[model samples]
Structures are given as structure tokens and as C-alpha cells.
Target: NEDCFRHESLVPNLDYERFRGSWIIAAGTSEALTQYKCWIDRFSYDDALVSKYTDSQGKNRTTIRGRTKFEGNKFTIDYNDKGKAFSAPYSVLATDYENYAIVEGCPAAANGHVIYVQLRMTLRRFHPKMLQHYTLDQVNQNKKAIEEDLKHFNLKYEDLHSTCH
Candidate 1:
């Protein structure tokens, strides 16, 4: 299942802990139908200066695990789908420290289905303001992304090798 091509917005900056420890998935698509899910993805930054995000079920699910560097109010995250490595644009980490953020990304196409998934999550301990605002932003962004996809999505579902034409 191409689980990455579903989300339209993502918040990656909830409980960053200075890029050092168990950062929680504040909030996100726990909806069963969406596929790309949230299961208590708690992370901790080790002394070796590495970040670790372990799912609540205790699975080594860090696809291309690493912290995203923010620039100009935007950042890009690199991750792997178990072994299928990928980098995504439109990824974000809310720097508000309020415990909520937005992360969005995916390649133009991955496999036969253009994988452009964006996800937004808020932490359970996040401030209400952060959660509310991030949630609102997610909805708005999703609507916009959907509109663009409708216009640009190639129903043909091309793989990464295929050209955007």
C-alpha cells in the first residue's frame, strides 16, 4: 500500500526536545482508513546525537530516520519506507514549541501511484492553542493540496521512473 500519498499536510515540530529525545507524534491521522497511521511514535535523541522514534507497538519503524532542519519557515525530511528510501518536499516542523506541527512531503510519483502525502500532527501534551491552530492549518492545507492533485494527478499512476509529462 502506498501509504505516503494520502496526507496533505504534516507538522513535525511537536516536542522536538532540542532535537534530542523521545519526541511524540502529538497528533495525527489515527484514522484506520487513512493507512499512514500514528501509534505513539515516541522518540529520544541519544548521546551519539541520533534521534530515535519508536512506535508505541515497539517497532523499529524509522524509515530513513533523521531530524529535519528548518530554513525560511520550511524544512525537508528524509525518510525510508522500511527500505525504500525517499525524500519529500513540503515537509514542515512547527517551531512554536507549543507541541504541534505540520509535516508534508513525498515524491512526484512513487510506484504507479503518484505519492504526494502530507501529514499534520499535534502532541497530546501540546498547548491547546498550538493544537487548534495546527489542526486548522492542516484542514486548510489539505483542501488546497486536494484541489491541486485533482488538477495534476495522472490517473495513469506512473512510477518514479516515469516522466511528469
Candidate 2:
């Protein structure tokens, strides 16, 4: 009876070291949050992901600074919020080991403060669809990757826009 919610491995050798440099989050979806662009940087110890937007000064920032861990065919990011820690599971659903990757994760909070079943794709370009600049493709190539990984969830590519205001 060990069927405690799991997903099948979708990528072979889902390497973590290659997820470096600046990346434009092509898309992301979450039931707890709306569509927005997000930026990410991966390194030896940690990965910082941030999303900035102008909402009439309502709230303009969202960030996830994740501690990196690579093991057992998957990558996990343990990010902290205020003092609470959350572990996010990520899978390299599709990648070319260089310029593109389709990643999916189910981020969970310690006390259920944050929860999201998300599918995120990384494209190696600065587009209006990026979340780092308070704004926001590739195409069929990554799309194929997304489709294959998406079988585990019932979600879509969140808004692929550059601006939120």
C-alpha cells in the first residue's frame, strides 16, 4: 500500500547541472496563483526564482529561493518563505541539455500555506513573456515535451504574457 501519490519518470538522466544561467520561464500554471512570468538561476548550491510585476502597486513581487538537490533520477528544490520551508519537486520532462527544457513540479508548503501543481517550461531567450522584468516560446519542440509530462496532471500553460498590469 505504498501508492501515496506519485508520478512516472518522464525523462532519462534528468540532469540538474545544466540548469544554469538566466532563463525565461516560457509558461507556468498554479491553482493558488495566476499567470505571470518568472526568472530562474541554478548553481552549485541554490537556485533563485523570481517574478516581478506591476499591479498598480498592489503587490509586485513573488520569489522562490530554492536549495538544490539532485538524486534518484529527479531534482528537488527546497525553498523557504518567511521561516517556513517548502520542498518542490521538479522533473526535466523534456530537454536538449542546452537551450530548452520543460519542467513540472508540485510545490508544497509545510503547513499548507502554499500549494500548487505546476508545469513550467524554460526557454533560452529573453521575451516579453519573462517574469524577471515585471513583464513576460520556442514552439512544437517543447510542446511535445509538455504534452508527454502533462499526462500526470490536469493543467495548462499559464498566461504566457510579459505584463500583468
Candidate 3:
């Protein structure tokens, strides 16, 4: 049967140019290696720019920032934290345009070789919570499918405090 066989799209390549820009990543569970599930709304990315936001503890304070460049199909989303520069590499852009993505970085320990780290996230279009307490709608709007994207990511390199400028 046709269902038993495989099929491929005859579709043209996506104009990433059209989708290029800070596309906000508002919800997803994350495991930064050191910590467990931390749902992070890390922000969005164009060519070399990114932006994100969060309302931790009932107050809102956030901003948009740009990233430094790297070689090959990789790039670094650099931001300042506590007057220091920090960067995470864009290691992979999965074949599924709207489904999933992976990022990589270096971590330290007893070993001399750099250990790899990753965060997984599913995405939805930009949306605002339109609920009674300004939340229920958020829970329903994006219809988020987050498991590990709900936590802050950690690398064994150093303690980080995001400083977007």
C-alpha cells in the first residue's frame, strides 16, 4: 500500500530569508545538563539577532539582544551578564523547519575534553496570554508542548546571569 511505502515532499526549499528574525521561543522544557526540567522562553533568532522575555515572580523585566558570529553553519548568541560576555553556539538547525532545534556549548569538569550540552524545544507562533488572570489564555493560546523547555539551562563552565544589551 502507499501508506506502507514512503513519500517525500516535492516542495521547494523554504525561504529562510522570510522566516529570518527573532522568532520568540516562549515555552519548552530544558535540561542544561546540570539541572532538570526548566521551561525556558529563551527568545528568537533572525540571521544574527535574538530576543526573549519572561515574567519571573509576578514582575516583568526583559530585553532583546544580538549575537556574535561563528564559522560554518554555526553562530553564537552572545549576551552580557554581570558585565561579562557569554555565548552559546547554534550547533544545529534540524531539518524540520517548525518542529525542533538544538544548541551546543562547552562544559567543564575533571575531564579535559569539552563535554557537549543541549536544550530541546517545540515552537509556536508569537502569542500573549489572553486569560482571566492573564494566564489561562496563555495556557490555551500557543497550545505549547513543552517537557524540558520549562527550566533554565546550565553549563559547567560558569554561573550565568543574562545581560542583554
Candidate 4:
């Protein structure tokens, strides 16, 4: 039962160039970690990914830097937290570059328990590109497509918690 979720399949022919940009976390499977009022992922061509967010307590903006290595549609980030080093894998399950993306972290087994994390993010663009923020109306518009993708991971729409805009 602990190994129920398996890491399988990533977005085919994922164009790293197109996927490189800032994205907003619209919703996620784990609210405890993704419950931020605003979270952004800035992916750069230098293989660095920066996570920007407002601290829950301090309500102050902060950023974490990580080095990324990509293999096809799957990638790993090597980062440090308070001087402690850590590495984690992230897989792109689905993406459209221009609009949205679904990403899943590789499951980790620790102390006989498996931890899985998944997220749905909207693209953050500027000027003519326009930003895609989280909104009930937008989510409803993509309801069917999002639900279909989540089904493959044994997830439902209700499993996702929306982030505050």
C-alpha cells in the first residue's frame, strides 16, 4: 500500500526552452506545503531554478536557489536549506508552455512511508504574453482537461488546493 503511486511517464518531447520561465503555482496536492498566498518558480537557461514565495509567518518575500539537471522531461534540483544539502527529482507530466503545466515530484520512501507531491502551475508572462494567474473561472474552463490528466495519477480535482492570488 505504501508503494501505491509509481513514478512513470513524462511529457513527451518537452521543449526545455519554451518551458523556461516564471510560473505561478495555481494548485497542488499538498496544501501544507503549497498553501502560500503566492509562489513562483523562475527557471533560467543557466540550469538554475529559483523559488520565490512569501513566508507564512513573516509575510516577507524570500527566494531559494537551486541547480537543475534535466534528462528529457524529468529533472532534478540540487539545493541547500540552511546549510543542509538536498536533491529532488521533478517530472513534467503535462505542459503547454503558453498556458499551464502539471509537475510531479518523484516519490520518496522514508521510514516506510512514501511521500508524493504534485503541482499545477500557470505560466507567468509579461506584456503581450500576459500572466496566467489562478482564478475559479479559469480553472473551471480547463476543468475537463485538468481532471483527465490527474486521473492518471489516481488524483481527482478535489485533491488539489488552490493557492491565493
Candidate 5:
């Protein structure tokens, strides 16, 4: 059952200001399992987004910088990882700044397969708060809405894996 998820739509009339700040990755589904835990994304001015996480081995903290070019409700991010470069299109599937956000990495076809990734996150104005504990219930408060968003891309909420806080 390895099939690529299809692209559907993005959040309309997205407010970049509201979308800015730190967001905790409460749960997510990726093309490949991620060894990174306690994932947090910090969106800032000048088209910058920083991802901070702890690697599984040695639990060392790590950070990655990305340059985002926004176009409406979607943006393409170019990441430079120790001289290696890669880019991905990030579509804001759903968001409410104060509470939660559902973001998807726009899928691409390769060798007749699609590579898809999506994240369910909790929002906070500060990084410290973003690192705080996020209960399953707290994250799932928008379960109905999140599920609806996932459905649009032929995805299921049940497939998401919870991240360490």
C-alpha cells in the first residue's frame, strides 16, 4: 500500500503574521520515519523558518535553517544542510495561529511514486512555551477539523505518529 498522496488544496487568505512564531510538531506522517523528536518550527520575518529537534542518537539538539518564498497560502523552502541543498513546497492545509496548524509538504512524482509529508502542530508565541508538554487531548482538540483536512489529501489522522515533547 505504498502510494503517493495527491495534492488537493491550501489554506486560503493566509495571514503571514498570524502564521509566524513557534509551532510544536504534535504528530505527523512522513514518507520515511523520522528519528528526530521534539520537533519545533519557528517562522520568522525575512522568509526564514528554523527547525529545531533532538536526534535519536545521543539526544543532541540540532537546528536547520530554511529560506521560504511565499506565494499565497503555499511556500517553497530551500534548506542548506551542511552545504547540501534541497527544496520542498510547503502548503498550509489548515491553521488557526492560536491553537493548531496542519501543514503538508506538496507531493511530487518520482519513478511513478509520490512522496508526501504532513504535520499536525500546536502553536505558541514563544519558543519556551513551544517546548512545553502537549497532551494528546490538547493536540486532538481539533481532531474533527484535522481529520477533515487530512481527508482532502486521502490521508488519515490515525496514520500520524506522536512526537516527543
Candidate 6:
């Protein structure tokens, strides 16, 4: 954890439309333990959005709700858990709108350590044509990008994506 610390490497000028739909985790540390099923939508007010996601592990589904506010190119989620509010800051990191989205955030761990969570997800399941179109090199380059983001937080890629399904 010595290498872990916070610094800026965020996605610049994200297309906010990409945040409107559902997302599936394609790779990440948290993806290994609890699968995330996320949905985001615009609410009645401008600059305000509502989101819901389930943390499903084994047979349990812990649904989480958040009210997010957009500012410039980034947004911060005020999540309600067990009647208490917690803040979750999110960066778009990267997205193609069609295939994938990479997000990085610092959520506090149980021991009070600021753990960086880097989640890479796709709008759909993996496909061969997605690879053919994006190319393996491009994919690897994105992986490197994710790695650099993790490094900024003093973390490493845990390959927990095996249990994402």
C-alpha cells in the first residue's frame, strides 16, 4: 500500500450521455468479490442524477442508492447507506460510449485506509468483433492506462475479473 496515494489522472470532458445507461463490470478487484449491477439516469433537476446499483456476492444483494451532482467534467455521488450519507467521488477515467467505461475512485476501507477502486466495465458482454474493431493493442493500451491510474493510488491490478460473471 506504500505506492498508493491520490493524484489527478481523470478522464477529460466526458460525454455525459454515456453515464445515462446501465453498465456491467468487465474487470476489477471489486468485480471478483461482489458483482455490481448499475443503473444511472437523469432526474427532474438539472445537475442532479439518480443511480442504483447492487453489490451481489454469493447469494446476497445489497442495493445501494446515490444522488449525484455534476460539475464541469466530473460528478460526486452522495450515497445513502443504512440511513447515513457517504460521499463517493467518481471520475470517468475513460469511455467509448459503445464498448467500455473505466472509472476510478477512492472509497474508504474498513480500517480507514483510502483504498482506490479502479473499475473497468463494458456496456455489454465480451465479443470477438469488439476485439477485432478495437484491436488487441488498443485494449492493452487501455489496460496500461488503468494500471497507471491504479499506480496513482498505489494499487495493482488484482485480476479479480474471473468471478465477474
Q: State TM-scores per candidate.
A: 0.33, 0.53, 0.38, 0.70, 0.71, 0.51
What clash pairs does model 2 have?
A: 37-131, 38-131, 128-136, 129-136, 130-136, 135-162, 136-162
lDDT for residue 164 in candidate 2, whole number 0-100: 27
Predicted candidate 1 versus true structure: per-residue lDDT over 16-35, tens digit per residue? 45433332232332222122
Model 4: per-residue Cα lDDT over 98-137, one tens digit each: 6566776632312222222223354331333312344444
Candidate number with greatest TM-score: 5
Model 4 TM-score, 2 decimals: 0.70
lDDT of each: 0.34, 0.43, 0.31, 0.59, 0.59, 0.44
Off by over 4 Å in 4: 1-5, 56-58, 82-86, 106-138
Question: How would you order the candidates by TM-score, starting with the best?
Answer: 5, 4, 2, 6, 3, 1
Q: On residues 2-102, what C-alpha lDDT tens digit does candidate 3 reach at each position?
A: 12211222122433443243332322222232221122324444445544433443235445455555443344556655212233544332223344332
RMSD of each candidate relative to the true structure: 11.3, 6.0, 12.1, 5.1, 5.2, 7.0
Candidate 2, residues 111-164, lDDT tens digits: the string is 222212222333434344334332223434355555444544544444322222
Candidate 6, which segments miss by more than 4 Å at Cα? Answer: 1-10, 29-57, 83-86, 109-163
Question: How well does candidate 5 score on lDDT at residue 147?
Answer: 76
- Residue 141: error of model 1 in Å? 21
Worst 10 residues of 1 by lDDT: 156-165
